[PDB]
Symmetry: D2
Subunit: 115 residues, 4 copies
């Protein structure tokens, strides 16, 4: 499990559950091709998105559907979604934990990269 | 000045100066067309990106070239850039302030709509 | 105006208005003595807390009454208040801007020293 | 384990290791009495600070010695430390995860409260 996503809710002080996450990889033609997708669990985490074999060097985009999350709670959010774009494994395989803290008009995202 | 961008540096505790910012608007064909661009000033701010006449309802993407900013400081950042995608509602006098706080492996962004 | 405080609301995407702010300075006996206080304005800012003459080197604590702010909006917050403790160095012309972004169960604070 | 602290480093994209944490409880005389202390592990986490029996209702202060952390890395930080003050268990026992993301001139803290 080289790619993990964790989403927290800053309004309720709880994990953000059932948040849709889509991952894309930049193709040779500068196009974003679907790579993997899923929804966060009860712990606000999403595991098993890919494997070390499939997760090759490249530029990846992790899109977190924050808008749908907030609407389901009756709150009108600012962002359409949260996007995290990064180059991965360019110097060998690494483990990536992408964390996002969500608020209706703000979000913070950090990466924890393990070797 | 309905749209303003402010970028701060969390490592040095200062405005993020000369950060390239590109704004795009989603076109009818779901394509991002260039809308405006510029670089943050000494105060880490970018004003005059557009006018109220030109800034119509739609989905906009504010792209902040964070990578180039960090590389210039000798720090290898994590993100390729920071992106803020939102819908400009246009329902009453509204000024949009997009703020971003930058760290090498993290960034936070908030919108101040007044 | 060497010390300024800015408070934003991450839930409503607006400045945090009328937030009580208390500033303390650590005394010789390791006690926090009141230094200045006020409430954020409509722009979520608090200016004129002190002067360069009065703002000498020392350890300061900026306390933001976040609890009262959230309760007034009908939201039960997590924190009793937000505290920012720092050392004013006083080594060259320096203006201190203490910014805080508030959410019911979270807050972020950054210092912009220019 | 009703009280957990997790600290991340936003500059290096890694857990903040060996960060000293001191917890205090407000006494009857409005004084902060030492409650527990420890240092974050390799995963940037601090467990076993207290037990459900000892962690009674009250106002607690979690102090994270961020200054010492940054100085050890050769960076001059802004804050003397990060403090998180909250009322705990006022409506029954809860599990509290106090998370902090650190940068030299900024820090963010969130609480995840479980029942
Ligand atoms: O915008 C963000 O998310 C970064 C951040 C973090 C903590 C405290 C304040 C801020 N942002 C900020 C600042 Cl530094 C100035 C003016 C307006 C805003 Cl929204």
């Amino acid at each position: 499990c080289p790619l993990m996503v964790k989403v927290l809710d800053a309004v309720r002080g709880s994990p953000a559950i059932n948040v849709a996450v889509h991952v894309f990889r930049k193709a040779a033609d500068d196009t974003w091709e679907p790579f993997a997708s899923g929804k966060t669990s009860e712990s606000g985490e999403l595991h098993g998105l890919t494997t070390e074999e499939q997760f090759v060097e490249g530029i990846y985009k992790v899109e977190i559907d924050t808008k749908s999350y907030w609407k389901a709670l009756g709150i009108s959010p600012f962002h359409e979604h949260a996007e995290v774009v990064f180059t991965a494994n360019d110097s060998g395989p690494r483990r990536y934990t992408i964390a996002a803290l969500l608020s209706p008009y703000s979000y913070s995202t950090t990466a924890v990269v393990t070797n």
